[PDB]
Amino acid sequence: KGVQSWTLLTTPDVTCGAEQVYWSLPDLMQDPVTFRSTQQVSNYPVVGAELMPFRAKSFYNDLAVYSQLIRSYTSLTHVFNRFPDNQILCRPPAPTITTVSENVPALTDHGTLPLRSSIRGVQRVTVTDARRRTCPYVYKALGIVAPRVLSSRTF
Amino acid sequence: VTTDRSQRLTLRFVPVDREDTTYSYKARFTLAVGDNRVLDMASTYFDIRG
Amino acid sequence: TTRVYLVDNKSADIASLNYQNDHSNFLTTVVQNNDFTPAEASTQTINFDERSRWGGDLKTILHTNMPNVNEYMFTSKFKARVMVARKHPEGVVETDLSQDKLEYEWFEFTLPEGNFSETMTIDLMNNAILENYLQVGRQNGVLESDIGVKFDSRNFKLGWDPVTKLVMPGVYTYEAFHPDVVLLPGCGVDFTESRLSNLLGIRKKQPF
Amino acid sequence: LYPIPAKATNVPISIPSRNWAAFRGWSFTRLKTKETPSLGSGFDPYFVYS
Amino acid sequence: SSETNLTQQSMPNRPNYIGFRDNFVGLMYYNSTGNMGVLAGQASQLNAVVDLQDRNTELSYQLLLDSLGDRTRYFSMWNSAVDSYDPDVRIIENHGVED
Amino acid sequence: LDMTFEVDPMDEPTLLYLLFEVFDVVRVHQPHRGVIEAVYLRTPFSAGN
Numbered sequence: 386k387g388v389q390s391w392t393l394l395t396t397p398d399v400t401c402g403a404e405q406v407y408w409s410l411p412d413l414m415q416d417p418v419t420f421r422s423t424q425q426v427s428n429y430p431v432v433g434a435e436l437m438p439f440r441a442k443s444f445y446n447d448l449a450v451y452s453q454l455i456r457s458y459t460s461l462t463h464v465f466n467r468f469p470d471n472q473i474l475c476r477p478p479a480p481t482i483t484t485v486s487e488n489v490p491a492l493t494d495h496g497t498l499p500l501r502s503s504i505r506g507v508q509r510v511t512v513t514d515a516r517r518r519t520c521p522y523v524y525k526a527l528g529i530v531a532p533r534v535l536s537s538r539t540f
Numbered sequence: 541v542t543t544d545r546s547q548r549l550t551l552r553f554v555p556v557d558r559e560d561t562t563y564s565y566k567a568r569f570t571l572a573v574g575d576n577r578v579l580d581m582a583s584t585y586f587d588i589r590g
Numbered sequence: 591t592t593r594v595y596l597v598d599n600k601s602a603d604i605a606s607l608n609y610q611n612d613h614s615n616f617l618t619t620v621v622q623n624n625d626f627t628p629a630e631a632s633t634q635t636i637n638f639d640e641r642s643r644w645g646g647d648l649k650t651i652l653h654t655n656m657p658n659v660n661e662y663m664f665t666s667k668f669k670a671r672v673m674v675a676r677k678h679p680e681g682v683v684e685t686d687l688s689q690d691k692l693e694y695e696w697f698e699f700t701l702p703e704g705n706f707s708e709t710m711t712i713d714l715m716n717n718a719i720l721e722n723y724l725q726v727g728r729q730n731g732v733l734e735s736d737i738g739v740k741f742d743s744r745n746f747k748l749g750w751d752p753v754t755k756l757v758m759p760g761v762y763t764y765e766a767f768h769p770d771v772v773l774l775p776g777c778g779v780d781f782t783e784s785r786l787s788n789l790l791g792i793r794k795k796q797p798f
Numbered sequence: 799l800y801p802i803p804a805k806a807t808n809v810p811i812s813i814p815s816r817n818w819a820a821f822r823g824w825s826f827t828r829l830k831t832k833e834t835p836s837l838g839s840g841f842d843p844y845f846v847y848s
Numbered sequence: 849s850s851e852t853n854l855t856q857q858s859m860p861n862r863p864n865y866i867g868f869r870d871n872f873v874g875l876m877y878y879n880s881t882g883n884m885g886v887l888a889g890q891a892s893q894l895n896a897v898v899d900l901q902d903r904n905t906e907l908s909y910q911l912l913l914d915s916l917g918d919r920t921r922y923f924s925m926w927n928s929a930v931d932s933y934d935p936d937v938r939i940i941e942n943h944g945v946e947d
Numbered sequence: 948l949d950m951t952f953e954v955d956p957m958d959e960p961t962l963l964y965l966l967f968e969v970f971d972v973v974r975v976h977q978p979h980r981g982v983i984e985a986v987y988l989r990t991p992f993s994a995g996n
Contacts, residue, residue, distance in 0.1 A: 390795075397769055397791030399658045399708050401665045408650060410596065422893030424566065424884065426559060438654045450764065453709065465713040467720060468734075476716075477743040478766040479709045486706075491652045500644040501894075503996050504636040506621040507607070507881045507901065510596050512614045512652065522656035523614040528596035530646035532638065539641040563610075563841040564883065570890070586876075606838035607881055617882055625814040632881075633900045635995025802954065802961040809963050813948040820990040822968030826952075831960040837880045838901060889982040896975065896985040900994055903971065 398441040398484040406520065407431040408495075409511045410528060415499040427517035433495035437520070441484040449479040500532055543576070552587075594620050594636065594646075603629035658789075659705035659714070665789070666703065668715070669780035671696045672722060672738035675730035694738070694777050697722060711789060712769060715741050738777040741790070742770045799834070868927050871909060878905035967992055 409429035416422050420430035446452070453476075457466065468474035512526045513519055558567040573579045599618050600608075606629070607617040619632040626634070638644050659665050677690040699718035705711065719739055723732070743766035749759040769790045771779055781787040787794075802809050835845040868875070877883035879899055887896045899905075913919060913928070922929040952963055970990040977983050986996060 393793050393795045394768065395791050395793050397708065397789055399706075399711070399789060401658065401663070401785035402788040406652070410648075413594075413596070414646060414648070416893050422888075422895075423568075424886070425557075426561075433648065433650065435650075435652070437656070438652050439656050449766070465717060471735075472762050473772065474735075474737065474740060475764075477712060477741065478764050480743060480766040480769075483708045486656075486658055488654050488656060493650050493652075495648045495650065497645045497647050500638070500646045502638055502640055502644065504594070504620065504638075505898070506619050506634045506636070506994070507617055507632045508596055508620045509617050510598075510615070519612070519614040520654070520656075521612060521614065521662055522654050522660075523612070523652070524655055525598065525651065525653045526613055527598070527651040529649040529651075530594045530596070531591055532594065532644050532646050533591050535643040535645045537641060538643055561840070564877070566883075568886075606836050609839040609843070610841055610882075611839070629901070630814070633902050633992075633994050635993075637995045800963040800965070802957075802963055804958060804960050805956040807954055807956050809952040809954055811950050811952070811963070811965075813967075816991070818948075818991055820970055822970070822991075824950075825966035825968060827964050828954065829962045829964050831962060834962060838882075840877075840880070840883055887983065891981040894984075896983045898985065898987050898994075900989075902992075 397480075400439060400441045400484070400486045403436050403439070404515045405434045406437050407513050407515075407517070408433045408435075408528070409513070410509065411511070412505060412507070412509045413501060413530070415501055417498070427513060427519075429511055429513070432498065433493070435491065435493055437514075438491040439486060439488050442487050443482070444485050445482045447481055449481045449483070453479040497533070497535075499535065500530070547574075547577075595622070596620065599628060601628055603627055604632065657704045657706055659701050659711055660703060664783065664785045666701045666784075667698050668784050668786050669696055669698050669782070670719065670739050671777045671779075672719065672727075673732045673736050673774075673777065674726055676732045676736065678731070688733075692736075692776060696780070708789070711786075712741050712743070715786070736774060738774050739779055740772040742772050743767065744770070799829070801831075802828070870928065870930055871913070872927050873906045873910070879903045 409432050411422065411424075411429045414430070414432045416430040417432070422430065463469070466476040469476075510526055510528055511519065512523055553569045553571065555567040555569055558565065560566075571579075571584075596618060598613060598616060604617075604619060611617070619628055620636065621631040621634045623631055623634075656663065661667070671694050673692055674695045675693040677692075678684060678688075679690050699715070699722070701711070701714045701718060705714060719737060723734065723737055727734075727736075744762055744764065745767040746762050747757070748763045749757045749761075751758050769792070771790075771792075773779075781792075800809065800811050832847050835842045877885070879901060881899070881901045884895075884899050885897050888894060919928075919930040950965075954963075969992055970988070972988050972990075974986045975983060976986070987994070988996070
């Protein structure tokens with residue numbers, strides 16, 4: 386009858402979980418096994434997936450509540466502790482075990498995958514989230530392709 | 541010269557998809573040419589209302 | 591084999607294509623013949639033999655700046671239902687009973703953009719619920735015991751005696767076990783549309 | 799298109815080395831910068847004219 | 849409202865004709881690299897339209913219409929009505945007046 | 948190729964507009980009911996195939 390039945394307790398993280406990013410290079414890779422091609426704002430054919438370059442690094446200290454008490458002085462204001470006496474409304478204790486996010490550079494190789502027979506000189510790079518919209522917190526997305534032959538088509 | 545079968549002289553296509561941005565519009569059509577038709581593209585035009 | 595490179599070539603000639611864009615979706619030139627200006631080179635073409643199915647061995651490089659708490663990634667807003675008003679029945683004394691009709695509404699609470707720590711976000715989430723008590727509740731006469739919702743970290747019931755069923759220390763133990771939601775009757779919270787539950791460390795057991 | 803600065807009078811220009819087979823000749827004219835939009839991208843925020 | 853403000857003088861506002869451009873130039877994205885059109889079969893998504901950033905399809909059309917017909921005749925369907933000027937305004941023939 | 952244009956001074960920024968006259972052409976093939984294949988060429992000032 387309690388929340389045991391339908392919620393689940395899990396370790397918290399400041400990344401707020403994570404998501405895949407889908408790359409697409411519409412003007413270069415031949416569109417993968419069921420994708421139709423578009424100039425549609427989002428829905429370009431995916432060419433490879435990664436987690437976003439943004440991960441939780443585990444952090445532990447005792448004296449976390451002590452750090453919070455020292456901040457209770459050195460902040461010079463009470464705005465986050467309006468009820469210092471009320472034990473239910475009291476500012477909650479800082480976790481001893483906790484996370485920080487690190488935004489890390491990432492470098493990857495995807496599969497050998499098929500390539501349009503002739504290439505226009507103006508070309509396109511896209512990074513999109515699981516919702517297929519473009520992540521604004523991107524700097525320096527890049528692609529590097531070594532072309533090669535798969536198989537003859539001329540018989 | 542002319543077919544004695546039932547066939548439209550003029551066709552009209554409704555967009556199958558369309559997208560908007562702050563400064564542009566984009567619409568996708570399936571232009572269908574039936575099994576004994578031939579279409580001279582000079583006859584085609586985008587009829588727009590607004 | 592060769593290499594063809596898909597890189598954010600900045601110069602004003604190609605920036606003329608960048609204007610409505612950002613580094614997550616951009617147009618660039620793969621053509622790099624250095625006596626052609628990037629505009630001039632951009633219209634040219636690399637042209638593999640038509641008799642062969644070609645494939646790219648593709649590598650990529652990605653970097654990013656994403657703040658923990660933001661609007662775009664749904665780590666900034668939560669729905670909560672809290673007391674909007676508390677009436678008093680006419681001709682009863684105001685200090686005497688405090689029994690009357692109470693009223694509640696759903697609001698969505700917005701945390702400051704760019705924000706960047708775990709306990710800070712819990713303190714910000716509580717400040718948001720306080721801010722609506724200040725902006726509404728103070729005037730309609732809800733008592734500041736009656737805040738409706740609070741985020742906490744403690745294990746209440748820790749010093750609780752099995753026999754006499756009170757917290758024997760006379761205090762709740764001030765130590766963080768795991769984040770928690772503390773509610774009063776008639777009210778609640780909603781993460782249907784946020785990733786703040788994943789930062790609370792609370793997840794739905796049947797997620798779909 | 800090549801930029802002619804305000805009050806400039808010699809406009810030198812060069813084309814990098816290339817093959818000219820089937821070339822037909824040259825046509826040329828002068829334009830104002832405000833009377834010319836840059837078609838590269840989807841909207842031109844500097845095109846303050848109609 | 850005052851005695852001297854009876855003496856104000858009005859001038860009509862400058863005439864300003866607004867409408868669509870000759871043959872709707874600019875209404876469709878020709879020669880704009882991020883916004884190309886598409887023509888393709890349904891089975892292969894390979895586009896038959898290969899546009900370039902240094903082509904000028906709008907101007908090319910205005911010149912071809914003049915080579916094919918007479919631009920001095922106005923056709924409302926294609927909004928065909930060539931940009932013109934009064935030559936008596938362009939080159940002033942100051943004959944004076946027969947007064 | 949070098950070209951030097953001598954021109955009258957103007958109080959506002961202007962552009963020299965050049966048209967390198969060229970053969971810009973296409974050929975279009977339609978071998979099966981579902982498809983169309985276009986071959987482009989631009990003879991001087993090329994942009995491939």
